[PDB]
């Protein structure tokens, strides 16, 4: 299970940036995906989830309405569309494969991350 | 910063060190399962413990966890120099809209 | 329930479901569809 | 709507027999068809179904692999090919027109049936 | 025979009699619609009731039915000599490969 | 219902090998199929499932990403393609016909299997 | 090995022997139906019991099943020499990605 | 878009009668057609449909087997052939051009209608 | 008739009069789009509303409608003498073999 | 590939006008063709399509029954015959070569158009 | 107009600007591929993008786009004075009889 | 079956060149033909097809309008007329006999090829 | 080039090697049959495999292959020195105007 | 040998013996009509059945047949000693250049 982040860079504030992850080693269409991020010097923060068939999309309240999560199953690719990026959105963004245990879930496989910096 | 973790933990090689994770009725005593991730300084967090006690087959049996009430924890026995890392707990908070919540993270230093 | 907790809940298993009848379901209208 | 069976008779076990149902009064090609049978002293047993376009076929477990169901739309005719007849296959065979209600289906028009006897 | 029916019922002309089917969670309590067929001694089954309560225009309002839980029923009011017949339930059992299942069949005897 | 298997033999680790389960006695296209395996001296392990129309495929975690399951409905044949064979993959592989009861499923008919050995 | 089974069971011809299959809240107590398979030394597994208590027409009534909580069971009465076999239980573990899980398998020895 | 009914009149029951519509203003061959009718003092009742290429036909349950719908694309003409007219078939018959919206269809252009009376 | 309409509605010129159309789980609650037709005293029906809310360019913006659950409705505002007409609702009933089904029609009377 | 249009000009309303598009650089007989128009100051409106062999024609609702599309393969020419011109038909008309991608089509090569004015 | 486009977009040379095209379940979210055309002030439109992401060899990699749900988009990077043009989107509306539908077009002004 | 290329050589860009294949061993008039080419150091590229009766011709997008394919059944010969040769047209050209399997076709017999060089 | 092939494969005489050919929904998974050709250094390509699995009588059974999903493959067993050659796959691409499309081509080197 | 036929069938005089013929999507299920020929040991084949069910005036009604899916068959009832013969099926394979294809041929042996 290999997840590969791509698309970081530096964003003038107010502008958009589109991130994505390519996957291999498993059947992409059978799994849900997550995005998480870590601002430098900060702990981990959950950002968004998309179901295996796009039936559900949930966002952290701090990014909802600014960020959009989507998938193209035929390309084994997960996308995150961030609009109106703020300074506070600076972080390393990571992909993870959704997993679930019993009364709560978890991510099992992780990629390496890519950095998005929002600055004038 | 939903689940409370100490900012730091340490001990001599060979010793047992622990990282706590404390929540409330909304996220640990809530009946939710606690998970742990280990992050090395320049990479992604990796699953260490899941289901409170279980672990990926790639994890040495030096690590274990447990829970009771609103308390949860991760213990490392036989601490090695290579265990220096940032440890995070993870759960689900009944009061929030997100699928996952994280604890604040704890930094483990091995006093080699 | 007068005080059901409303909305769509997170915290569910988002990974298809490998526990379903994989066979053809012989219970569907076998007639031509005039629509 | 008139449904008429033909082809019964007496056949020793192990041999084959072919039944057919001629139809008129409705557009044959727009409907699926069923065969059911009634042993001479028992209730009704479902035997087989064929879809209006011939794309699907289903068989009762008691006959699957021995019986074949088919249609010829240009002759407005339904056929049932029975191979490896067993004594247990003695029954009156009837054709019926497929109908469907909501969560389950039903037959609406029935033929008269024809008798197939399997015996030394 | 996944739908159980009494083997025989009876009554005098003018009386009310019932015929019923008992299923289970896979066939009636499963939400699958119940149908009834009538067979006279020397002919093919005729649809009597469909959709639990509906009936062909060729059936007099003497016959009616219902569905509740895993139970289904056919009621005949104003019983006539001409009602001597075999009555059957039909439904769909989700545990089987066949489209239709039938009940055992009940013979109604009118005590003329 | 007859299930027939062929394709085993011995290969060096790292090699690929394809197994094939031929079927007869039932309508292949109406059923999903399973593969399980039994390492010598061991119990049974589920390996893979394929839906009747190929719309879904699932794999045991121990083989996911290395094994592929597929169907050729026109020839009534089920295939398993194993890439990157490891020593741990030595086993008798068996095909089976999918069946389902209520809250869980089961296999009903079984093939005889074939032996795949992975060793220099 | 997901479902727990004893490695061995035995008894003399004419005796009754049982094979247990114990799970947990994720696989048996989870409401998932339990199935049993029989393997003879030189063949492919045969379905013995399905749906906890039902069985193929090829199985004599010497075999029966049961399910209570997380404990599933197979009993064999009228034990014959011919019953020497490996018996396996099967269910579905909701914590795993696979369609089927098997128990360890129990070898039944008939004390001829 | 003109649709013009012709061929009405009065017949004894048991007799046949043939209705038709001439069309103009649109490409006849690109659209399916419908017939509906309205008994005096009553609401509307759907009678039949024919597909643009003549490949499919569907009829109301009360007329199937007695009525035939057909079309000649080279003459821009829609026909309805009624056999065994019954007293109950007295109605004004109308042509309409098929249209389809999303989950259901509708007629958009209508003719003027013609009256068919059945009486002895 | 599988769609129920009131046989008659009325109002004074200038008032708003609504015509309902009630179906069930097989036609409106099933998601099939509802259409409306208008018939004047000596002519063929004219399409008034299509697609539940849309209308031909030949229809005054006085006519509009909606769909909710198994209910549908046509609202006529600014009632004019010229609106005296029969209005019919149309949909598709998945239990029947025909492409279209109609209600019985409602006559709108303008109280001039 | 080159598409050349000629035939515009100004006419009184109610008059007819025949436009044509001459082509070169490709095999005319292998491709379908389109006409679109652009009223001055407005965006693009699709008008009509003709199939490579002339077997099908489709028209925008706004012109069907008034406009005719046709072609003559022996002269590599596409024609549009407009009858009953209205003031609203004033536009620059363009021809284009049909192309098709997957689930929808597109034009690839375009002519330069010609202007048709309809006015008193 | 069938597809919705903003009437205007602008920016300074060197900037990135985007032009949206929003449809619905019948035209973009319907699975139909979206195409884009570029019209310069005194000529016929040129195919810019086809197949949602592909482009003619006569178009520099300055222009690219995507489609998600019911929203399609044209991105222009490294905006030049020479990009002043009208950009149009195109798709197919399954509710209409025509082969192609267009948006109203967006005029891109470069703020030299 | 022999297919023999002739007419290769070298020309300055802008000039024409005409290739052909003499054929024998089969009935030329019953088969369609293909031309393909291979630039030195490159893979294979399809160029053109001509139908057995000359009714259809198709060309690769990169050559249509510059190349013409033709045949003369009375001489059992296939021709390719190339006008405006470009440097980019340097390649070995080959004939192949059309064959067709089911959903796609193939060439079965191939010639020897001839080299056309375009250079100043 | 629309079909993807590795530029090179290899192995010692006596080895088994495979050559892949990967396409998409326009040319392999599209239901179009895949064909293979063999080219030796000084001549025209020769048909090796046709119809995905069939081959000319001039080809020894050392070469075989099949197609599934969007990936086709040529298997060579009993690799000989004589097998050094360029192998190409071929199909039909429904998005293009040409009858045939080819892959890049793979050179097979036998490590003698 | 394009169409598959058993090499031999048999039965005693008076009995029913059938001869199968199986093709595929290229030659029976392809919509091509199936024909049958009868060959006696010292002569040329005679047309027995044509058009799947029709036969020459020179053939007694002892021979009949049919075609369904990819299967075809010749039935002989009232088997006579004189029926000892070779029977062949014939069709057209859309993948081949020849007008006719034959099956392997079946010899019918009468058990006199």
Author numbering:
A (entry chain I), D (entry chain F), F (entry chain D), H (entry chain G), J (entry chain C), L (entry chain B): 2 to 52, 52A, 53 to 82, 82A, 82B, 82C, 83 to 100, 100A, ...
B (entry chain R), E (entry chain P), G (entry chain O), I (entry chain Q), K (entry chain N), M (entry chain M), ...: 2 to 9, 11 to 27, 27A, 27B, 27C, 28 to 95, 95A, 95B, ...
C (entry chain E): 103 to 137
Paste lines from the article.
The circumsporozoite protein (CSP) on the surface of Plasmodium falciparum sporozoites is important for parasite development, motility, and host hepatocyte invasion. For many years, the leading target for vaccine design has been the major surface protein of sporozoites, the P. falciparum circumsporozoite protein (PfCSP), which contains a central region consisting of multiple NANP repeats that can vary (from 25 to 49) among different P. falciparum isolates. In addition, PfCSP contains a flexible N-terminal domain with a heparan sulfate binding site for hepatocyte attachment and a structured C-terminal domain with a thrombospondin-like type I repeat (αTSR). Here, the cryo–electron microscopy structure at ~3.4-Å resolution of a recombinant shortened CSP construct with the variable domains (Fabs) of a highly protective monoclonal antibody reveals an extended spiral conformation of the central NANP repeat region surrounded by antibodies.
The cryo-EM reconstruction of rsCSP saturated with Fab311 at 3.4-Å resolution demonstrates an unprecedented open spiral structure of rsCSP, which is still present with IgG or with flCSP. Here, the cryo-EM structure determines unambiguously that the epitope consists of only two NPNA repeats. The Fabs are so closely packed against one another that their two epitopes are seamlessly stitched together without the need of an additional repeat as a spacer. The two repeats of the NPNA epitope adopt a type I β-turn followed by a pseudo 310 turn that repeats throughout the length of the spiral structure. Because of this unique repetition of the (NPNA)2 epitope in rsCSP, the proline residues consistently point away from the center of the spiral, serving as anchor points to which the Fabs latch on. Unexpectedly, neighboring Fabs that bind adjacent (NPNA)2 epitopes contribute 319- and 340-Å2 BSA to a novel interface between the Fabs. Close inspection reveals that the inter-Fab BSA between two Fabs (A and B) binding successive epitopes of the rsCSP (interface 1) spiral consists of polar contacts that are made between BCDR L3/ACDR H3 and BCDR H2/ACDR H1. Many residues that are involved in inter-Fab contacts correlate with somatic hypermutations from the IGHV3-33*01 and IGLV1-40*01 germline genes for the heavy and light chain, respectively. Salt bridges are made between Asp99 of ACDR H3 and Arg93 and Arg94 of BCDR L3; in addition, a cation-π interaction is found between Arg94 of BCDR L3 and Tyr98 of ACDR H3, where Arg94 Nε and the center of the aromatic tyrosine ring are 4.2 Å apart. The affinity maturation of inter-Fab contacts is likely driven by somatic hypermutation of Ser31 to Asn31, since Asn31 hydrogen bonds with the repeats using its main-chain atoms, while simultaneously forming a hydrogen bond with a neighboring Fab using its side chain.
